[PDB]
């Protein structure tokens with residue numbers, strides 16, 4: 534019953550569905566092979582991610598997916614976001630086809646690449662050199678800021694910006710994920726813990742958590758938390774603090790400590806991002822420039 538949009542429509546028979554990547558309120562995601570995503574090379578294979586509805590989805594579920602699809606159409610393409618590739622709306626189930634990042638999300642990317650602990654026996658000339666270096670960590674932060682700046686310019690507020698919502702390509706390019714999700718901000722279970730132990734309330738700006746107010750400056754707060762995640766190499770924010778305690782600590786103006794092996798320049802940016810007044814936090818344009826200066830000084 535959905536209208537045809539020839540600009541984005543992709544023949545569903547050119548998809549070969551593969552391994553499920555995840556399922557939830559937002560639909561289910563399946564890895565797939567696509568043939569001829571580039572119309573110039575009709576028989577060329579590529580690996581993509583496909584969002585679709587679940588089993589006994591309701592009419593609301595379909596509306597939510599159609600909405601996310603249209604939002605992704607509207608926002609357009611950028612290097613540092615997960616981009617819309619095509620859609621399947623005709624003669625069959627609704628598919629939304631997007632880019633698939635090979636290396637997973639940034640949190641797991643970092644946690645899997647923490648430096649060798651002294652418990653490992655030295656072997657060869659690089660025994661203490663881990664996969665992650667400071668300039669690459671800074672580059673990760675810079676790329677996310679660039680993506681958010683783009684999303685900002687298209688009037689998009691993410692509302693959950695976190696390392697888990699940043700994906701990493703085969704070339705270590707950062708791509709912001711799920712930026713067009715309806716997130717039900719008027720019915721958030723602040724005590725909710727995910728299957729992997731995440732407490733999403735720990736990324737919310739105070740004005741969002743306490744006043745249900747979101748601006749781009751709310752995302753800047755979240756970016757500050759994400760900065761902290763990066764330079765703890767995928768650590769969980771507010772260590773050992775449960776949600777009830779988080780509430781009172783935030784009301785008292787509590788902020789996270791400077792992490793180990795983190796230069797003052799970057800903790801400085803974190804603390805700026807967590808300034809109480811939204812207007813006293815940097816803009817994403819300012820964050821891009823600030824991080825670019827560090828990047829150029831160390832590259």
Ligand SMILES: */C=C(/F)C(=O)Nc1cccc(C)c1Nc1ncc(OCc2c(Cl)c(OC)cc(OC)c2Cl)cn1
Nearest residue numbers: 562582583584615629631632633634635637638710711
């Ligand atoms: C396809 C390979 F790269 C792959 O299997 N990648 C992979 C493997 C494990 C874990 C992750 C996170 C992962 N990457 C990955 N990349 C993209 C992706 O797409 C999800 C998705 C969808 Cl379906 C939509 O549809 C609207 C929007 C969106 O955003 C925007 C994202 Cl991120 C899932 N996983």
